[PDB]
Amino acid sequence: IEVKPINAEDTYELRHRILRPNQPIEACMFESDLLRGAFHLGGYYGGKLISIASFHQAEHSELQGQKQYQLRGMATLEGYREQKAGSSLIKHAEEILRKRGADLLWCNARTSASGYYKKLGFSEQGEVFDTPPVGPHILMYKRIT
Numbered sequence: 001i002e003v004k005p006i007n008a009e010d011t012y013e014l015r016h017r018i019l020r021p022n023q024p025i026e027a028c029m030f031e032s033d034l035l036r037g038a039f040h041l042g043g044y045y046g047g048k049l050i051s052i053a054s055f056h057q058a059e060h061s062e063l064q065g066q067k068q069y070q071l072r073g074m075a076t077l078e079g080y081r082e083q084k085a086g087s088s089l090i091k092h093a094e095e096i097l098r099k100r101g102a103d104l105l106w107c108n109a110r111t112s113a114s115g116y117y118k119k120l121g122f123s124e125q126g127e128v129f130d131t132p133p134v135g136p137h138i139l140m141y142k143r144i145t
């Protein structure tokens with residue numbers, strides 16, 4: 001797996017295929033992509049972009065840490081899961097975030113992926129909530145100080 005920078009526009013296809021296939025493509029054009037300091041990483045395997053992850057600065061009112069980043073659009077293509085593609089993106093992002101002085105990385109995780117974030121050392125906070133039309137989510141975070 002090779003981790004490389006990618007542009008926001010490079011994430012839309014996999015966001016649409018994996019996360020939001022039953023909505024128009026504009027639903028994958030996350031407004032947070034246009035927030036200050038946003039960046040995106042791709043995981044490449046055998047000539048193909050097969051994993052994506054997007055990050056931007058956002059402080060959650062219920063999490064503690066002066067500088068925080070949110071993860072959006074975490075996805076790995078079927079066929080290429082279980083190869084540490086996603087973990088590789090998160091670890092590479094943690095380097096970038098640590099270098100920027102970020103204290104914490106958080107995600108409104110799909111509950112179906114909660115065990116993935118747990119393996120990466122994230123904790124859950126609060127309760128499960130629903131996010132139309134993409135189902136149950138739970139706040140998860142990782143302190144990176």
Ligand SMILES: CC(C)(COP(=O)(O)OP(=O)(O)OC[C@H]1O[C@@H](n2cnc3c(N)ncnc32)[C@H](O)[C@@H]1OP(=O)(O)O)[C@@H](O)C(=O)NCCC(=O)NCCSO
Binds near residue numbers: 107
């Ligand atoms: C969740 C994920 C991005 C994981 O990507 P991946 O590239 O397969 O992850 P990975 O780095 O290989 O997996 C790391 C560890 O977590 C585990 N894992 C992966 N997906 C998991 C899940 N959904 N639930 C529990 N554990 C999971 C792996 O088995 C691995 O554990 P081991 O080291 O013990 O073998 C991918 O399954 C996916 O795209 N799922 C569908 C979309 C999704 O739910 N994305 C998360 C969005 S949060 O808003």
